[PDB]
Each structure stands twice: as C-alpha cells, then as structure tokens.
Design an enzyme around this catalytic site. Structure first.
Site, PDB file in Angstrom:
ATOM      1  N   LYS A  26     -27.490  42.325 -20.076  1.00 45.49           N
ATOM      2  CA  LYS A  26     -27.855  43.162 -20.467  1.00 45.49           C
ATOM      3  C   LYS A  26     -29.178  43.310 -21.372  1.00 45.49           C
ATOM      4  CE  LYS A  26     -25.366  45.813 -23.242  1.00 45.49           C
ATOM      5  NZ  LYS A  26     -24.515  46.945 -24.059  1.00 45.49           N
ATOM      6  N   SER A  52     -30.636  48.108 -19.624  1.00 40.71           N
ATOM      7  CA  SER A  52     -30.694  47.726 -18.217  1.00 40.71           C
ATOM      8  C   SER A  52     -29.752  46.570 -17.986  1.00 40.71           C
ATOM      9  CB  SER A  52     -32.179  47.540 -17.806  1.00 40.71           C
ATOM     10  OG  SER A  52     -32.886  48.586 -18.176  1.00 40.71           O
ATOM     11  N   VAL A  53     -29.231  46.496 -16.976  1.00 40.96           N
ATOM     12  CA  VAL A  53     -28.248  45.202 -16.506  1.00 40.96           C
ATOM     13  C   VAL A  53     -28.541  44.490 -15.275  1.00 40.96           C
ATOM     14  CG1 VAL A  53     -25.791  44.569 -16.338  1.00 40.96           C
ATOM     15  CG2 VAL A  53     -26.589  46.463 -17.930  1.00 40.96           C
ATOM     16  N   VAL A  78     -28.153  45.736 -11.562  1.00 37.55           N
ATOM     17  CA  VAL A  78     -26.729  46.205 -11.333  1.00 37.55           C
ATOM     18  C   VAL A  78     -26.785  47.819 -12.029  1.00 37.55           C
ATOM     19  CG1 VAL A  78     -24.462  46.494 -12.639  1.00 37.55           C
ATOM     20  CG2 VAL A  78     -25.465  44.108 -11.404  1.00 37.55           C
ATOM     21  N   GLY A  79     -27.460  48.216 -12.991  1.00 34.44           N
ATOM     22  CA  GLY A  79     -27.455  49.569 -13.539  1.00 34.44           C
ATOM     23  C   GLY A  79     -28.508  49.747 -14.591  1.00 34.44           C
ATOM     24  N   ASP A 112     -17.310  47.615 -22.831  1.00 34.81           N
ATOM     25  CA  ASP A 112     -17.892  48.796 -22.825  1.00 34.81           C
ATOM     26  C   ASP A 112     -19.129  48.759 -21.866  1.00 34.81           C
ATOM     27  OD1 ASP A 112     -18.986  51.346 -23.234  1.00 34.81           O
ATOM     28  OD2 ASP A 112     -18.047  51.676 -25.338  1.00 34.81           O
ATOM     29  N   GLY A 168     -29.749  52.575 -17.995  1.00 31.64           N
ATOM     30  CA  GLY A 168     -29.685  53.749 -19.082  1.00 31.64           C
ATOM     31  C   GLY A 168     -30.415  54.066 -20.024  1.00 31.64           C
TER      32      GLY A 168
END
Ligand code: LI2
EC number: 2.7.11.24
Length: 351
Positions: free
Chosen positions: A50, A34-35, A27-28, A165, A30
C-alpha cells in the site's frame, strides 16, 4: 545498506519500490492509498504493497499516517495483519514524502467464503474463534477496530483467518448512506452516535458476522440508518430505561422513545437449526447495551468453542503507548515521528 529502488507508473500513480518487489499489479485505490500485489523475492511471499496518498498533506492526515504505522508495527499475532516491511524512497527527512506498507497478500476474504461455499458448524466455530482470538489480542492493547466486516477478514484455503483494514477512503456520511455493507455490521451506538463507545462495538460486528456465516445472509441489511435500527430493535428488543439513561445524545434518546416497544425475539426461531450453543453466544453478543455485551476474552471460554479453545495459546498484546492520540503537533512534527518509525523498523523473523 539502503536498497536500490526502481520506478514504475501504474494507473497514473508512480511507484518507487525496492528491487526485491517484482511483478507489481494494481489491486485497488482510494483517497487514502493505492494497493499493488507483488512478489517479494527476498522472502518468497506474495505481498500487498500500500502506497499512502499524500500522507502529510494536513495535520489530520499526518496524524493518521503516524497512527497506522504505530498500530502496524505493534501488531504481532497469528490472526491479525503483520507488517512485513515499511519503506520510503527518501534518503533524508527533508525529502521524505511517501510511505509504503507491505503485508501478506490476501486474495480471498470472508465475504467470498460466505458467498461461494457451504460452511458447516465446525467452520463457523473455527472462523469466529479466530476473529475472537485476534480481538482479544487487539483489545488487550486498547485498540478498537471499529469497522469489522467480512471484507476486512482475510481467509486462506486451510480456513485460517486474519483481521485487517482495507479502508482506502475517508469514512464519510455518503459512504455510510443507504443500502450499504459499509454500515450493516456497525454497532448501533456508533451508527447513531449515542455515546462514547467501548471496545465491544467490535463484538456487535462479530455477532453480525457469525449470524451471516450461519444463515448465509446479512443480519441487518438496512436501507438506511433508521431502517437498520428498526431491523436491530425487532430482533433484540427496544431499550429499557437503564440503557436509555446511558444515551448521552438527547435527540437520539428522544427518537428511540417514539418507537413502539418490542420484546427480544426468540433466537432459535430466527437461526433455525443452528447449534443451540451458537444461538446462546449470539444472544450474548447481540446485546444493545454495550456494558452488557460479552467480551472477546469471555467469548473464547464459551462452550461453543470447546473444540478450539486453549487458554495457553490465546495471547495478549504488549503494552501499547497511545499518548500521541491526545497530543497536538504540527505536520512536520507528525512527519518526523513517522520518519523515525520507518527508520527503526525491524522485519519479522524470516519468514
Ligand atoms: O490493514 C491495515 N493496514 C494495511 C497495511 C498494509 C497494507 N498493504 C496492503 C493493504 C490493503 C489491504 C490488503 C492486505 C492484503 N492483501 C490485500 C489487501 C494494507 C493495509 C490496517 C490499518 C489500520 F489503521 C488498522 C488495522 N487494524 C487491523 C487489526 O485490528 C485493528 C485495526 C489494520
């Protein structure tokens, strides 16, 4: 009793998760994590997992990992993210090096709601009521979000809203620079570091969010910190001497005084055609002096929410011990505290 874990590489990241979690899908990612989306076969829920990135690389990171876990284990409210699971593939403290956090999968956030559909005044009432209801809960635990914005608000098809968040990177100056949603919802006192900040920094954000739900447009889309300040002061007026005294930063105080004085605008002539009660509430949230801003608890009692307000169903948090915040420990100590909280985790009622 320990689940079996299986391994999988996804975008150059190794994922080791219990067998219950299937169909992992990126999904994403940073600097902080990571997700993946996944299907939890035990609960039947679509979840987001996550994986924290190098959670114990430094003292600062080790402490942040502990803080998040503590926060997440504590928050049990309908309008706030819930921790479904926390796990590590480690069989002991000695090999403990990874932490995975699981919650309900979002999909739609408030940004895509406001971008992709017509919202009635009834929708705005319900959405903001839920944000304020969550905030009452978190604020009662002396927890401040600080980064409230549409992308941190999950919204389902029945318009039900949860505060979370989705920050996965370090909150640097670069990320806060320029024409960026990263800064548009921030209270001025935190954007310009005027002073020690209170929990009503989150109420300023709610005002900005409410405004955008009403108009469809960003309230203060500044091209930089100072342009954004000018947009804010144009609406709400330049500060008087009483607020100026409270600005601890001499440099910031001196800058504000260089600005030509401006009156507070008429909010009915900005938010044209909006419910007068919505205009009234906006005026109480979008107050420069954070001492004078309406609280979440006060706001829930405002006539704008007469339709939804129920004082017997707006709960507060259990006491939250944040003594650790003032405390100086080694990485291995923060790590052991974190390990204990993983091991002690009890899943929420099924489900
Ligand atoms: O949301 C948070 N953490 C978290 C936990 C597990 C997760 N799994 C996946 C993600 C990424 C976000 C996501 C969630 C669901 N679907 C898609 C993506 C994740 C994040 C979080 C972190 C914090 F430090 C504070 C708050 N608080 C929130 C309440 O107000 C105080 C701060 C929330």
């Amino acid at each position: 009793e320990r689940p079996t874990f299986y391994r999988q590489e996804l975008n150059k990241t190794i994922w080791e998760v219990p067998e219950r979690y299937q169909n992992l899908s990126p999904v994403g990612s940073g600097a902080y994590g990571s997700v993946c989306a996944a299907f939890d076969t035990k609960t039947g829920l679509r979840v987001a997992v996550k994986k924290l990135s190098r959670p114990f690389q430094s003292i600062i990171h080790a402490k942040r990992t502990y803080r998040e876990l503590r926060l997440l284990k504590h928050m049990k409210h309908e309008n706030v993210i819930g921790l479904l699971d926390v796990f590590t593939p480690a069989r002991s403290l000695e090999e403990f090096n990874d932490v995975y956090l699981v919650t309900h999968l979002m999909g739609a956030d408030l940004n895509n709601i406001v971008k992709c559909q017509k919202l009635t005044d009834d929708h705005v009432q319900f959405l903001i009521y839920q944000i304020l209801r969550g905030l009452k809960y978190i604020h009662s635990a002396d927890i401040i979000h600080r980064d409230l914005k549409p992308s941190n608000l999950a919204v389902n098809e029945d318009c039900e809203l949860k505060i979370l968040d989705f920050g996965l990177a370090r909150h640097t100056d670069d990320e806060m620079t320029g024409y960026v949603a990263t800064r548009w919802y921030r209270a001025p006192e935190i954007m310009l570091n005027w002073m020690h900040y209170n929990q009503t920094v989150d109420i300023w954000s709610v005002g900005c969010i409410m405004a955008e739900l009403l108009t469809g447009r960003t309230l203060f889309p500044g091209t930089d910190h100072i342009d954004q300040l000018k947009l804010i002061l144009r609406l709400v007026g330049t500060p008087g001497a009483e607020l100026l005294k409270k600005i601890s930063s001499e440099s910031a105080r001196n800058y504000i005084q260089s600005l030509t004085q401006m009156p507070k605008m008429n909010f009915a002539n900005v938010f044209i055609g909006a419910n007068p009660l919505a205009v009234d509430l906006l005026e109480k949230m979008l107050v420069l002096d954070s001492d004078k801003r309406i609280t979440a608890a006060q706001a829930l009692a405002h006539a704008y929410f007469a339709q939804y307000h129920d004082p017997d169903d707006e709960p507060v948090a259990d006491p939250y011990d944040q003594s650790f915040e003032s405390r100086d420990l080694l990485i291995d100590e923060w790590k052991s505290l974190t390990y204990d909280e993983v091991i002690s985790f009890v899943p929420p009622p099924l489900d």
